[PDB]
Amino acid sequence: AFRYTRSQSFDIFDINQKCFVLESPTQLVALHLQSSQKVRLNIALYRPRQMPVALGIKGYKLYMSCVMSGTEPTLQLEEADVMRDIDSVELTRFIFYRLDSPTEGTTRFESAAFPGWFICTSLQPAQPVGITNQPDQVNIATYKLSG
């Protein structure tokens, strides 16, 4: 279903200017800086065999994925090597559609495994990054990326 093309590194902030920080090897949180380091994203751009992407945490050998946990969709970080082919339902956990609103320069990320579910941060600082089916509704699911 998807075939790797290339990766590009981006800075990322949510629209309330929180950045991502890798709090622990399995925990990404969003906070306001100034202290510690912001995460950059290594965005792997794919082609169906829409902007399907994988979101790598630059320098830490981790990729974001969406999986069922219990009975709830859950965003988590997994150790994964760069993936050339995403050719199963299972592997689709790593794919997100990058949805750019070009004129405003903002971006949302929608899970391919869990359509309708969007990468989101809390309105409060120092919470985990998660996913929601109510994007931008008592959460922030809109970001600004810069190369």
TrEMBL record:
Record flagged with keyword Coiled coil: no
Compartments, as annotated in UniProt: Cytoplasm, Cytosol; Lysosome; Secreted, Extracellular exosome
GO molecular function: cytokine activity; interleukin-1 receptor binding
One GO CC term on file: cytosol
Biological process according to GO: acute-phase response; cellular response to cold; chemokine production; cortisol secretion; detection of lipopolysaccharide; fever generation; immune response; inflammatory response
The entry's keywords: Cytokine, Cytoplasm, Inflammatory response, Lysosome, Mitogen, Pyrogen, Secreted
Keyword hit for Secreted: yes
Family to which the UniProt record says this protein belongs: Belongs to the IL-1 family.
Protein name: Interleukin-1
Originating organism: Gallus gallus
Residues of the full protein shown: 108 to 266 of 267
